[PDB]
Amino acid sequence: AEIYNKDGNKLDLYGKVEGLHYFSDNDSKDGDKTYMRLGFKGETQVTDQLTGYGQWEYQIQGNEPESDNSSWTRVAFAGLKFQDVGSFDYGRNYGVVYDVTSWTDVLPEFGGDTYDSDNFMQQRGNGFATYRNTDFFGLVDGLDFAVQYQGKNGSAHGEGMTTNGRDDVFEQNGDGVGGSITYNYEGFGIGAAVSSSKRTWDQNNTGLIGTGDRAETYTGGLKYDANNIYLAAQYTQTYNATRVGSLGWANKAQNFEAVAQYQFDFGLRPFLAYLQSKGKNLGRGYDDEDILKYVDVGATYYFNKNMSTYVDYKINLLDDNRFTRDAGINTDDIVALGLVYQF
Amino acid sequence: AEIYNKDGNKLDLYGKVEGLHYFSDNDSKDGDKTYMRLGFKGETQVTDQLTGYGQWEYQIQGNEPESDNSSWTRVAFAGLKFQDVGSFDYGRNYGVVYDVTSWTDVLPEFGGDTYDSDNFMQQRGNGFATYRNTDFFGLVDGLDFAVQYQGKNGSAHGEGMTTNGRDDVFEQNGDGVGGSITYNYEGFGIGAAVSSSKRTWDQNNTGLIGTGDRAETYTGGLKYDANNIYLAAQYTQTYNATRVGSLGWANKAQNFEAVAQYQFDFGLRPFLAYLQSKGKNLGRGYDDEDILKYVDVGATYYFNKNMSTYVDYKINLLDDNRFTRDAGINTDDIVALGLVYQF
Amino acid sequence: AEIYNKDGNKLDLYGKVEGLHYFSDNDSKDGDKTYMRLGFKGETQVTDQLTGYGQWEYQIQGNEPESDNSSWTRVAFAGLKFQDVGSFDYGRNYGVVYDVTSWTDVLPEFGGDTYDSDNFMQQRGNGFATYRNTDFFGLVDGLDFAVQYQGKNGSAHGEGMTTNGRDDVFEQNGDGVGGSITYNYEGFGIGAAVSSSKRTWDQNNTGLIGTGDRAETYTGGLKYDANNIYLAAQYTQTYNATRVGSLGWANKAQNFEAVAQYQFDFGLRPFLAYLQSKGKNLGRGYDDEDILKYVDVGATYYFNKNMSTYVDYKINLLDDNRFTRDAGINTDDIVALGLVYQF
Ligand SMILES: CCCCCCCCO[C@@H]1O[C@H](CO)[C@@H](O)[C@H](O)[C@H]1O
Ligand SMILES: CCCCCCCCO[C@@H]1O[C@H](CO)[C@@H](O)[C@H](O)[C@H]1O
Ligand SMILES: CCCCCCCCO[C@@H]1O[C@H](CO)[C@@H](O)[C@H](O)[C@H]1O
């Protein structure tokens, strides 16, 4: 909620409490999943053209006991925006791949999981320098593009080290570049995004699958957002980029997400979806294996802009086999029941 | 403080800094105890009858160095409330036992410690689904009741596991049900609350005292709140529910708290109290032993709605013996000196 | 930003996102250094004379992955202030030494590092009871003084223990007293501050350098703040107080900081600085060694009260030798590039 607006600066303090509960035969995905998010979006007017901004967003689990409570920063960046020239921001933010893949990431709780956080330039991560452009310098109504750089986030100790080092190799990344082009026009949307990033020595020399000099992704996306209907689909091909449970990464992966939603006037919003992640030439005798594969069904009911409830049902199509057990990937169904307050 | 109220939704952002210091011969209870709380209470009007809400509250210790700072979510829930039918909320909240036992939990710093947090349904804990009713469907002015369910919060690894697992057995709980009835009338208050919950395999199979299939509690409470006077008392009998230091739980426990307070017009509010927790048939050669026993004396001075100071003096009546030393229970006195700002 | 002000109480909710990046040949000081601060300053009017207040400030790193995010309380105190008599506050706060040494701590990112946090009474730390006086009881315009007490912050286990114990000996302290006198007059500033504090048994009996019964400091400071110019300098002599990397403390240390800044009307603010910390009679064959020594150059550009960017360049004059390598002190240069949003 916009709690402050005076003399050029305005601040939006926003958050939600998500009363959430998972039902699953997988005990590790069964139980209380309640959490809270808090954040601010700031905006200051510098000149006629220039404006400065800063966003921060934070998650604090609400399903843990008081002796040990986990929380983390989702985004934290600051930037400048100049009318018809572009914007620049730096900090923890979403990678440019997400500019397109986010069109399918629209379900209440599940979905958007053919990629993780801190997964190179595919979603949220540290050290993003991002240039964005709206309506191609104000000339083409609806044509947006972005060029982004991510600086190396290395290990905590030894060489290949950075000030913000991290022992988990799945959260590390070398220097990377990516970009995206988006075009919307009266309901329709065509999108593309490419990214390439050096992989660190640690994530290429600890006996994991899917090693190589670079982690790369290629994304294309379609959508339709009008007349109470939402349809979307994204296709992304990755190399040494998609995480394969605990085993490592997939040398090659073909990701597909599709979503269909409808919005009734009285507040109900059913949805149907299908996600899939096919790994190819994984090595170590695995060959071609589904990393992710599930239908997702359910509905959200909006009481209000501030209150909603939902049922989100993940029908897991993965088979329980030696590959999935070695990686520790969930093959069981999950039902998420939500009750959410926002402001 | 209510920092936002517009078009049906209103938000109260509240908090306090409690400048606090303990004086004690027990070194582990002697020193700086300064802390901070922050929270929001949200309320959105859906219809004439229906309203949606969400509360979050957080504690962050202010007595630690910057290298290592502990903090935790006290509550985090979201709910709906329908006039003259009831309310429903889910998330981290207070158990229904507290509906009555909270009448004695009214001292500045000590008190309210014949039970812990994450102690089955006795106080704050994860995964509470709570139904509450005000004035018995609007028919009986002052008759409130509540029915509550808590879902299993298991271990972090192995079986008996949940998505929000926790290695500390004292914070675990199986599926539980409880309830409470409250009646207030022109200053007086009669209350009752029962709760029963399955205990987990981990908390019944790690060689601790007070094991059994179920942890159970039975509570009755009296009070008087008028003419600048506050009196209250609660009696709760527990089985396999009251924690006994580190040794385990008490197979049977009889808890009693009594409080007397008076409020002077100029801001001073003296108080006298007595808490006691008698364990019975504890096993392992212990027999009947006081788990908790102390008089509590002192006073708060209110400068304002936003500023207060207090002296809270815990006279520990427990004897230092092999039982208390084995459990690690404090037998020494503590004096808490407070200086508090609120908003 | 002042987000609340009603019926005597007013609350300022303030924060910043600092998009920050270090460039260094030292890998441990090279990379993303992005962070966020959040805080509130509260003020309640009790009477004509008396006012109650409370400040809290918090840092949350923005350069870490979601699996592991570090954050900490910088300050957390509550106090009363009586017109022309003085103020009193308790909690986590700045020590009185900082009343003078803070005049040089005015650079964007570096500087203010001839002392650490939780470093006895030299900067921020737990358990400060501080009395302050403005304009010497309202008699002398510009003469301020302060008397401060810090209570022992001991170890986590054993004896020499406190309720807020801490295993890191560099964060521990015994009972201490200090004070400061400040005089400002039409742009000029003369300041002095002394502090003495018992050192704990743990920090005198773990085989570190710079042991002794007491950690002591003696500070003098000059400054000039007017006509778009800022000049400042502080000299502090310490005994058993200045931390020497990992090796321990310096038995004797002579600290000097000097700063020169200029503020252009169009927003640019160049600065030049020099910090130095000379250790004397360090023991263990080290003799006299520079603990800290660097020139600091750069500039901040203010777009606005809410938005700024800066280059902060630390020219490290320390030589790489066996002393600095044993202590783990950085001898390499660092360049910090900042983009900041505030509110
Ligand atoms: C507002 C500040 C903008 C800073 C943009 C970041 C510039 C990228 O800086 C990069 O950081 C990497 C470590 O993360 C180093 O390995 C690279 O050498 C360096 O070029
Ligand atoms: C808004 C969402 C409401 C969800 C109410 C919680 C329903 C209780 O769900 C319970 O959770 C337990 C694990 O915690 C499981 O062991 C039980 O089988 C399950 O019934
Ligand atoms: C608002 C509350 C004000 C309390 C002021 C703190 C009083 C100092 O209390 C000191 O604490 C030390 C441990 O930290 C003990 O070792 C000392 O014996 C004790 O005097």
Author numbering:
A (entry chain A), B (entry chain A), C (entry chain A): 1 to 343
Excerpt from the publication:
The subsequent isolates retain this sequence but have also acquired further changes: at D18E (OmpC26), D18E S271F (OmpC28) and D18E, S271F, R124H (OmpC33). The mutations observed in going from OmpC20 to OmpC33 cluster around the constriction zone. In OmpC26 and OmpC20, a water molecule and S271 are at the centre of a hydrogen bond network. In OmpC28, the S217F mutation changes this network and moves the tip of L3 (centred on E109) slightly further (<1 Å) into the pore (but not at the constriction zone). The bulkier phenyl side chain packs against the L3 loop and the L3 loop is as a result slightly displaced (<1 Å) into the channel. The aromatic ring fills a previously open pocket adjacent to the central pore and but has little other effect. The S271F mutation does not appear to influence hydrogen bonds. Direct measurement of cell survival shows that a porin-deficient strain of E. coli transformed with OmpC26, OmpC28 or OmpC33 is, in each case, less sensitive to cefotaxime than the same strain transformed with OmpC20. We do not believe that trimer destabilization is the principal cause of altered permeation for the following reasons; OmpC26 and OmpC28 are stable but are, like OmpC33, less permeable to cefotaxime, OmpC33 is functional and conducts small ions as a fully open trimer, OmpC33 can be purified and crystallized as a trimer and finally OmpC33 transformants are actually more sensitive to a different antibiotic.
Porins, which are beta-barrel proteins that traverse the bacterial outer membrane, facilitate the uptake of small polar nutrients and are the main entry pathway for many antibiotics. The crystal structures of OmpF and OmpC show that they are both built of 16 amphipathic β-strands arranged into a barrel with a central pore. L3 folds into the channel and narrows the pore at about the half way point, forming a “constriction zone” or “eyelet” that governs the effective pore size. At the eyelet, there is a strong transverse electric field due to the presence of conserved basic amino acid residues on the barrel wall facing acidic residues on L3.
